[PDB]
Design a protein around this ligand. Structure first.
Ligand SMILES: [Ca+2]
Ligand SMILES: [Ca+2]
Ligand SMILES: [Ca+2]
Ligand SMILES: [Ca+2]
Ligand SMILES: [Ca+2]
Lengths: 573, 571
């Protein structure tokens, strides 16, 4: 989409190359005869002589004469444009421009079906470049590299005194590698440029391209590759550019999946107690008709997608899988237990269709505060698909948001319910039992119901924790566009610790495995009332009516899930 | 403007703090008697109870009740909400909430005329920070600082068991220092937080914030400062957050100025005699009514503007100031940097200009490029988006050797001058055909001998190809037309590595002090008494209003900011 200028002189004939599709400006005035106010152009039927305001159209100060051609040329110097400068002095003098048509096309998957700028939206243009972070040769490799096409319809002797170059910038060299289809090293991290060898006539050359980096602060995510026609007709002067065509790719980002998407594969380890646990997980996986891949003998699995492949990726701190400082900046808040993703959301008009990442930190910097490493936050922010949200999770001894918040599948409203821990519903549930007579039922050491409702230290300890969780509630009701009819509160008692940090009293029921629309909740080991645990009766009476089904286990599991449907390139960040 | 949630229990009365202007949610269902189906709220004339589906509003699963007050409190627990639950077979029970009003305002110059998000445009909201790069004491210092205000209207006993804290992130700490008005050192590069001391009643505290960094790749340009109202009523439990307000600043960028802006003050360097040079400069310098400050016995001067001050800047490799160890290339000098006048490209408007720097056409082993750090620095400043050109074919690598922009009274109000080897040959040929073809040039040579050298006529054809490439690049990326490109005669020659060099002194590298132009001497052919190149350039430039002189050729010219407020442009 970038050509050059053609100046015609009556003194000598001129030779020029016009690439088909490019509107080439013809200078018909700077080199005109001394006196004249007229000019005309009789061209061959293959030359489109466009003019902007024969008919002798006068030599306007600026008269934009542009020229394109229709049929590519195999004859070198065939289409002849002859000008007629007739002013007032003798029959007109005439100038000759012996042109030629060539067709250098660099096509790709810009239409995103599978301007030279990358645009987002249901209507835009752009190519997608996946990263090679997996171990798979031949076709299997051909199916995850991109496919650029270079067609060259040129005269037979055109490439005797012309040459083509395909080059990247010296900033993007290390983030992209290209192979010329056998597949061969063309450009790459050490070589910034390459010259090509193209025979005359029609010769199509297909390229394959891989990225070697994920988007970050140093790398926005856009790569550009350029083809240029360097005219080389004299061996004593440097080469000259006559045409340039570029293309822009965007590297696909790291996308994380929440607990509403249907499961695909589950995993586990061998602490030699699973028999009791794995026996219920194994039943659950086939309750939802899933696959349970046991593993015989801190990890988050997302998906990176292009129009041609949906390769998954693993992140931590095989064939269809993937991978993305250890010394310094190490704390307990750097774990992926401090990372969650909300379901698709709509906040004050804007639509977040892939979710909104959630990580926890402190409320205000101090000397004893803990934070997640800035490198990880910058990495997650560079992935503009899921804009992260900062919460408060430093009042806890561990430092993880998964202690108090979860999301469930649901068949109503936004199609999900936010489960939040609640110290205030446990006290209510205990008091409804004390005011009915059975107030000496034992809990869990072991303690009665009354001895927990008559402890004035635990009550303050839990009032503080409730004041802490309500802040996150308010944060989640404004940055997730939520409403009260979508929050369910699950009873949970807390106690404080070294450095007055919080720790759950009985094992959390908010950190639970959603291997489907019916799931696994850790045992409360709570009071028994009428042959049944009271906490269990309340959580099953709040969750089941939506349509879920709940089990209870005593208590590692990762549930690889289904990539989202919304194509990330159709979103407008 | 965050706030929190208040939960009411019939068992015990509840106390809460409601900051003014924040819509606070009230939980009237989670903790209600198990037999109720109806509820009502009687409150003092100050509590604005807002109910969205005593009228008996039933206990809907999501009946929402939000509260605000239309006043301020100086007494703890002075507004009492009494929620009247009505039992079906039981006399009504009633929860008590003892509210209080406190006002905590953190205001700044967000209206940009003097949401917690920084928005661009004529209708946006944001505050602007200027960088501390001047040697300016207190009186002038408070002139370029920011002015953030914090007003607190609280009961006298409120700040006994409550504490206020102002904090910055552990990333933006190194790029902002905070002073509290006597100015004192509080939150800055080494200290990330500060607990304040506020007396009860009315007490306004002003702050002054300065930045220490320019926008770059590592720093987008936005700095947030947060005020948090905590609660320390119990001495054993950890402190708890009750309210949060925030403000977002943007650091003003580095802006350059083109050759179409009026001059303010020229400069010079008496390295040599240059008596003639100085005379001519001062002459057209007072002719354009611009003061000529001389030096007593490569540097680009921009402007960092804010809604409170337009302090300039100086960039190199009072006033203002802004690296790579070494091994850099000559393409890193500032003769490679130019700025176009405001343009309108395909509907889009660039009202501060569009920067221009040259580099190679395609990377190679012998190619030379401008350092990546400088390009990233310029790209960080989104006001003037740079444009890459081709200048590697020269033996110096500077775009100033063929392009220039002049003032003009027509069309876009300017003309782009480009060097042209093809007009020098034309004028020489007209002067040979007319008869005076043995006039001597500048190793002296005649007109005929230059027109009959076949090594030069190829050296010049290559340069013409390169300059036409640059012309197409400048017509598409600057929205230009062929009625705005005046071509200036110039001949070139090739040297070691086949790089290019001007033959006669470059007349396209000119000093523009308004309608007066110091064009370097061409030392060229004389015809009928005057020089031919001079006659041509005075016949092409003068008609549109300019006036020319010919010195025998360092002068920098500080100028006028376009005054077009950038915060009104939307990049
Ligand atoms: Ca490989
Ligand atoms: Ca998680
Ligand atoms: Ca200072
Ligand atoms: Ca100052
Ligand atoms: Ca310059």
């Amino acid at each position: 989409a970038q050509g050059t200028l053609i100046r015609v002189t009556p003194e000598q004939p001129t030779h020029a190359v016009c690439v088909l599709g490019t509107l080439t400006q013809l200078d018909i005035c700077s080199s005109a005869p001394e006196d004249c106010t007229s000019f005309s152009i009789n061209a061959s039927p293959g030359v489109v002589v466009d003019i902007a305001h024969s008919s002798t159209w006068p030599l306007d100060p600026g008269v934009e004469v542009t020229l394109t051609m229709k049929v590519a040329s195999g004859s070198t110097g065939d289409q002849k444009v002859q000008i007629s400068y007739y002013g007032p002095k003798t029959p007109p003098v005439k100038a000759l421009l012996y042109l030629t048509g060539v067709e250098i096309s660099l096509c790709a998957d810009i239409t995103r079906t599978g301007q030279r700028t990358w645009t987002w939206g249901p209507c835009g243009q752009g190519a997608i470049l996946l990263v090679n972070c997996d171990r798979d040769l031949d076709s299997e490799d051909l199916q995850d590299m991109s496919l650029m096409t270079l067609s060259t319809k040129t005269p037979k002797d055109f490439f005797t005194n012309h040459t083509l170059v395909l080059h990247v910038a010296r900033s993007e060299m290390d983030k992209v590698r290209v192979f010329q289809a056998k597949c061969s090293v063309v450009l790459g991290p050490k070589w910034p440029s390459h010259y090509l060898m193209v025979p005359g006539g029609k010769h199509n050359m297909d390229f394959y391209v891989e990225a070697l980096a994920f988007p970050d602060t140093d790398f926005p995510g856009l790569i550009t590759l350029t083809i240029s026609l360097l005219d080389t007709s004299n061996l004593e002067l440097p080469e000259a550019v006559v045409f340039q065509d570029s293309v822009v790719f965007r590297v696909a980002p790291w996308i994380m999946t929440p607990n509403t998407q249907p499961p695909q594969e589950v995993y586990a380890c061998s602490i030699f107690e699973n028999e009791d646990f794995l026996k219920s997980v194994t039943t659950l996986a086939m309750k939802a008709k899933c696959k349970l891949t046991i593993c015989p003998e801190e990890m988050e699995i997302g998906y990176i997608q292009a129009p041609h492949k949906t390769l998954p990726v693993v992140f931590d701190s095989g064939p269809d899988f993937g991978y993305v400082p250890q010394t310094g900046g190490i704390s307990g808040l750097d774990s992926f237990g401090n990372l969650e993703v909300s379901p698709p959301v709509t906040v004050r008009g804007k639509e977040y269709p892939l979710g909104r990442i959630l990580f926890g930190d402190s409320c205000y910097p101090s000397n004893d505060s803990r934070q997640m490493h800035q490198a990880l936050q910058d990495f997650l922010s560079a992935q503009q698909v899921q804009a992260p949200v900062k919460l408060y999770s430093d009042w806890l001894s561990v430092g993880h948001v998964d202690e108090f918040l979860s999301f469930v599948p649901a068949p109503d409203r936004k199609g999900f319910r936010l489960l939040l821990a609640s110290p205030r519903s446990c006290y209510k549930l205990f008091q409804e039992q004390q005011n009915e007579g059975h107030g000496e039922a034992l809990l869990f050491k072991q303690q009665k119901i009354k001895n927990i409702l008559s402890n004035k230290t635990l009550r303050e300890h839990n009032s503080f924790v409730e004041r802490c969780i309500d802040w996150n509630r308010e944060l989640l009701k404004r940055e997730l566009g939520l409403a009260e009819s979508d929050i369910i509160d699950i009873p949970q008692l807390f106690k404080l610790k070294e450095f007055s940090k919080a720790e759950a009293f009985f094992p959390n029921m908010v950190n639970m495995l959603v291997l489907g629309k019916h799931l696994g909740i850790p045992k409360p080991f709570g009071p028994v009332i009428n042959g049944r645990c009271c906490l269990e009766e309340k959580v099953c009476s709040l969750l089941e009516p939506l349509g879920l089904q709940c089990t209870f286990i005593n208590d590692g599991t990762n549930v690889r899930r289904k990539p989202f449907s919304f194509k990330w390139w159709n979103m407008v960040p």
